[PDB]
Amino acid sequence: EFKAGSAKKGATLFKTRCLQCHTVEKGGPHKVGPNLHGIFGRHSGQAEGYSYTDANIKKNVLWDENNMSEYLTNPKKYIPGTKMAFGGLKKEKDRNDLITYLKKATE
Amino acid sequence: EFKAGSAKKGATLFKTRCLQCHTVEKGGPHKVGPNLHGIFGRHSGQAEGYSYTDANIKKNVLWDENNMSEYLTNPKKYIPGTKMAFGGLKKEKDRNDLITYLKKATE
Amino acid sequence: EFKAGSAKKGATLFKTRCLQCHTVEKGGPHKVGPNLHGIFGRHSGQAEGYSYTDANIKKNVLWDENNMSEYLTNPKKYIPGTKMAFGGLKKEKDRNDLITYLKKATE
Amino acid sequence: EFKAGSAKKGATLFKTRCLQCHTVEKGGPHKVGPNLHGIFGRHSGQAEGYSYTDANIKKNVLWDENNMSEYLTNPKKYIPGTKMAFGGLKKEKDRNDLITYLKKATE
Ligand SMILES: O=S(=O)(O)c1cc2c(O)c(c1)Sc1cc(S(=O)(=O)O)cc(c1O)Sc1cc(S(=O)(=O)O)cc(c1O)Sc1cc(S(=O)(=O)O)cc(c1O)S2
Ligand SMILES: O=S(=O)(O)c1cc2c(O)c(c1)Sc1cc(S(=O)(=O)O)cc(c1O)Sc1cc(S(=O)(=O)O)cc(c1O)Sc1cc(S(=O)(=O)O)cc(c1O)S2
Ligand SMILES: O=S(=O)(O)c1cc2c(O)c(c1)Sc1cc(S(=O)(=O)O)cc(c1O)Sc1cc(S(=O)(=O)O)cc(c1O)Sc1cc(S(=O)(=O)O)cc(c1O)S2
Ligand SMILES: O=S(=O)(O)c1cc2c(O)c(c1)Sc1cc(S(=O)(=O)O)cc(c1O)Sc1cc(S(=O)(=O)O)cc(c1O)Sc1cc(S(=O)(=O)O)cc(c1O)S2
Ligand SMILES: O=S(=O)(O)c1cc2c(O)c(c1)Sc1cc(S(=O)(=O)O)cc(c1O)Sc1cc(S(=O)(=O)O)cc(c1O)Sc1cc(S(=O)(=O)O)cc(c1O)S2
Ligand SMILES: O=S(=O)(O)c1cc2c(O)c(c1)Sc1cc(S(=O)(=O)O)cc(c1O)Sc1cc(S(=O)(=O)O)cc(c1O)Sc1cc(S(=O)(=O)O)cc(c1O)S2
Ligand code: HEC
Ligand code: HEC
Ligand code: HEC
Ligand code: HEC
Ligand SMILES: [Zn+2]
Ligand SMILES: [Zn+2]
Ligand SMILES: [Zn+2]
Ligand SMILES: [Zn+2]
Ligand SMILES: [Zn+2]
Ligand SMILES: [Zn+2]
Ligand SMILES: [Zn+2]
Ligand SMILES: [Zn+2]
Ligand SMILES: [Zn+2]
Ligand SMILES: [Zn+2]
Ligand SMILES: [Zn+2]
Ligand SMILES: [Zn+2]
Ligand SMILES: [Zn+2]
Ligand SMILES: [Zn+2]
Ligand SMILES: [Zn+2]
Ligand SMILES: [Zn+2]
Ligand SMILES: [Zn+2]
Ligand SMILES: [Zn+2]
Ligand SMILES: [Zn+2]
Ligand SMILES: [Zn+2]
Ligand SMILES: [Zn+2]
Ligand SMILES: [Zn+2]
Ligand SMILES: [Zn+2]
Ligand SMILES: [Zn+2]
Ligand SMILES: [Zn+2]
Ligand SMILES: [Zn+2]
Ligand SMILES: [Zn+2]
């Protein structure tokens, strides 16, 4: 389901839809949401120093491009009970582009 | 998000995937499943003389082309506890073709 | 043209699409379908103690990953007359994952 | 299932793998195979002036991009007894490119 898209558009989607709550850089600070560096290949709810809902820990997924796409389609449906206040990215090209940027920004 | 496809292809899809349990002709007989004539524009679980599950009755949808496509994607997810033994047409062209045929067959 | 995939999601596919009729572990019970331990590398229809159809027996193939994926694409096409009532896994990444799991659980 | 590919790329496929037996332009001449101008949207076995196997005529398909693709994968499997001596384009992107060229050259 995930196909690599445009990192450049993905960077703008993040600025307007996520940066509000998240930083991406290594060592960056948690805000409302956790810092996201190294999120791919990591278990849900494990960023150091961030205090998660139990449902984000207990979802128990190893983040990759595909379950990230599914999550960002509808976060509170993929993880019922999350404090991530965000409706979701409905359009699949917006998802591929954002995940393309996010991979590059967080690896 | 339903779109008219091939009724000839839908007829074939129907002969091979639905015909076992279903008829389409006006006043046709029930089999394992209810005869389907007049289904579009009727409430669910309302073919005369057929014993549905309570779930199929209480679902309380009015069949049109779009929620029919949603139903045929994963019938047990759309109507939990339905006794229809069918995995689903996962491909969208197949659902468009079948619904194109089915609308012509049952109207 | 099998390529290794995710045993973990192949596990998930097995219990949703196969477990109702099959067990996998060594010495496991026959149910509707035969216990499958040791399937890869055996001729078809050779699980001791299971009562097969003539067609599944006379098919005369040695199961590997490849012809298994052909079979699971359309079981009744590959073995005309089989009493396994299963439509098939149409998508290759689904068969890939399931076969990767099945091979690990049956070897 | 068909996806528009590269007409140019497909043009090179046709010269190497088809032109030996076929021509494409309006009014083009018959060779070993028939001239293919107007093939899409026409019944099988109809090109005016060519002598087809009865197998080709009785396949009774109206050619579009997708049953063309199916066909060119395995001609003898699609039309048993055809007199077209061509093993098939096994790679999916080769069929997409060729059909994309063929649509443009024969419409
Ligand atoms: O494969 S990708 O689609 O991901 C992709 C990645 C890059 C890339 O160049 C392209 C396509 S091709 C391209 C597409 C578009 S367009 O499609 O947007 O019109 C405009 C241009 C352009 O060259 S010109 C331009 C415009 C702007 S802007 O005025 O600030 O928008 C900034 C930069 C720039 O060169 S600098 C700049 C800024 C970033 S960023 O992501 O950090 O913002 C990335 C890159 C940059 O070069 S690499
Ligand atoms: O059931 S739960 O989803 O709650 C769940 C159970 C377990 C677990 O660790 C986790 C989640 S956390 C997690 C979630 C996801 S996921 O979000 O992508 O699904 C992927 C991974 C991951 O670590 S990485 C991984 C990848 C693969 S591979 O794909 O086959 O190569 C095999 C294993 C493995 O760990 S091994 C392995 C195999 C299985 S079983 O299902 O095959 O029996 C179970 C376990 C394993 O450790 S316990
Ligand atoms: O934001 S939502 O996730 O809620 C969401 C709701 C709807 C929607 O179209 C989308 C996303 S877009 C979408 C996203 C994803 S994914 O990225 O999440 O993988 C996969 C798909 C997909 O199409 S494919 C698919 C898979 C299944 S499955 O058999 O259950 O797997 C059933 C249906 C289906 O289309 S049918 C279906 C059934 C229902 S419901 O009423 O029965 O719940 C609602 C809808 C349906 O389309 S509207
Ligand atoms: O459920 S079904 O098994 O029936 C089934 C039907 C179709 C389908 O796509 C699939 C499964 S999925 C699939 C499964 C397998 S597998 O089973 O071998 O692993 C291989 C392939 C593949 O794509 S690649 C392939 C290989 C060959 S080969 O050269 O003969 O080997 C010919 C064709 C072809 O596509 S052509 C071809 C010819 C016809 S027909 O109408 O002329 O019979 C129909 C179809 C064709 O694709 S639709
Ligand atoms: O199909 S036809 O062979 O009749 C044909 C079509 C077109 C065309 O201009 C010509 C011949 S004339 C010509 C002949 C030869 S050659 O004889 O030496 O090979 C080389 C060139 C060239 O210009 S240069 C060139 C080389 C390549 S390459 O093959 O990828 O390296 C791609 C393109 C390109 O411009 S871009 C390109 C991409 C496409 S599409 O189909 O991918 O959308 C179509 C066209 C393109 O120009 S129209
Ligand atoms: O808009 S639609 O896409 O729905 C559509 C509806 C019709 C239609 O003609 C077409 C497209 S165009 C077409 C497409 C295909 S193909 O796509 O299958 O290759 C083959 C042909 C063909 O002419 S030739 C042919 C083949 C056969 S067959 O040997 O029995 O298959 C029966 C008939 C027939 O003419 S008679 C026949 C049987 C039926 S049915 O529904 O009762 O099976 C419908 C029709 C018939 O004329 S109307
Ligand atoms: C504020 C309203 C936020 C918006 C905008 C975005 N995110 Fe978020 N996110 C937020 C919180 C408070 C949390 C923790 C959730 C919990 O239940 O504890 C999250 C979580 C995530 C995660 C999971 C991180 C992990 O498991 O370690 C991801 C991958 C994530 N968020 C991504 C993400 C994206 C891509 C966003 C833009 C589309 C986005 N978030 C916006 C708060 C907020
Ligand atoms: C036997 C295993 C069946 C297959 C094959 C198909 N259908 Fe079915 N259908 C079946 C049953 C037993 C029921 C009643 C379920 C209940 O819970 O009461 C149904 C129901 C439907 C309906 C709803 C009719 C209504 O009045 O609400 C529809 C629209 C329907 N079935 C369509 C359908 C299609 C399109 C099929 C081929 C893809 C198909 N069915 C196959 C049994 C079986
Ligand atoms: C019940 C409806 C079943 C489902 C679900 C699955 N299988 Fe099946 N299988 C079933 C039966 C009754 C038989 C015997 C077939 C016969 O004709 O006698 C089988 C057979 C197999 C085999 C062949 C075993 C052999 O020794 O050759 C295989 C490899 C097999 N089944 C695999 C399989 C898979 C992978 C399934 C999930 C995708 C699956 N089966 C489901 C009954 C049923
Ligand atoms: C010589 C070995 C050929 C090669 C190379 C190609 N084609 Fe062919 N084709 C050939 C013959 C002798 C026939 C008639 C077969 C019969 O049974 O009568 C055909 C037929 C076709 C058709 C069908 C035409 C119709 O009117 O329905 C098509 C669409 C076709 N051929 C296409 C085609 C393509 C795309 C080729 C390159 C991959 C190709 N042919 C090569 C002889 C030969
Ligand atoms: Zn998708
Ligand atoms: Zn989907
Ligand atoms: Zn650049
Ligand atoms: Zn650039
Ligand atoms: Zn630590
Ligand atoms: Zn793991
Ligand atoms: Zn784990
Ligand atoms: Zn959708
Ligand atoms: Zn890093
Ligand atoms: Zn859709
Ligand atoms: Zn017609
Ligand atoms: Zn849907
Ligand atoms: Zn869908
Ligand atoms: Zn009527
Ligand atoms: Zn393949
Ligand atoms: Zn593990
Ligand atoms: Zn296929
Ligand atoms: Zn063993
Ligand atoms: Zn394909
Ligand atoms: Zn050009
Ligand atoms: Zn050019
Ligand atoms: Zn017609
Ligand atoms: Zn016709
Ligand atoms: Zn094919
Ligand atoms: Zn096919
Ligand atoms: Zn294929
Ligand atoms: Zn023309």
Author numbering:
A (entry chain D), B (entry chain B), C (entry chain A), D (entry chain C): -3 to 103
Task: Please quote the authors directly.
Here, we describe the tsclx4-/Zn-directed assembly of two proteins: cationic α-helical cytochrome c (cyt c) and neutral β-propeller Ralstonia solanacearum lectin (RSL). Sulfonato-thiacalixarene (tsclx4) provides possibilities for protein surface recognition (e.g., lysine encapsulation) while simultaneously supporting a metal site that can bind to other features on the protein. Whereas sulfonato-calixarene (sclx4) consists of phenol monomers linked by methylene bridges, tsclx4 is bridged by sulfur atoms that enable metal coordination. The metal-binding capacity of t-butyl-thiacalixarene has been explored extensively. In each of the model systems, incorporation of the macrocycle–metal complexes contributed to protein assembly and crystal packing.
Co-crystal Form I grew in the presence of 30 mM zinc acetate. Synchrotron diffraction data collected to 2.4 Å resolution at SOLEIL were solved in space group P212121 with an asymmetric unit comprising four protein chains and six tsclx4. Each of the four protein chains was bound to tsclx4 at Lys4, similar to the metal-free structure. Four zinc ions were modeled, with coordination by one sulfide and two phenolates similar to the binding mode observed in small-molecule crystal structures. Interestingly, a fifth zinc ion was modeled adjacent to the tetranuclear cluster. Additional density between the tetranuclear cluster and the fifth zinc was modeled as a bridging phosphate ion. Neighboring residues His33 and the C-terminal carboxylate of Glu103 each coordinate to the fifth zinc ion, while the side chain of Glu103 coordinates two zincs in the tetranuclear cluster (Oε···Zn2+ = 1.7 Å). His39 from another protein chain coordinates one of the zinc ions in the tetranuclear cluster. Thus, the calixarene–zinc complex acts as a bridge between three protein chains, one of which is bound via the calixarene cavity (lysine encapsulation) and two of which are bound via the metal site and exo interactions with the calixarene. Form I, in particular, with 1.5 tsclx4/zinc complexes per molecule of cyt c, has minimal protein–protein contacts.
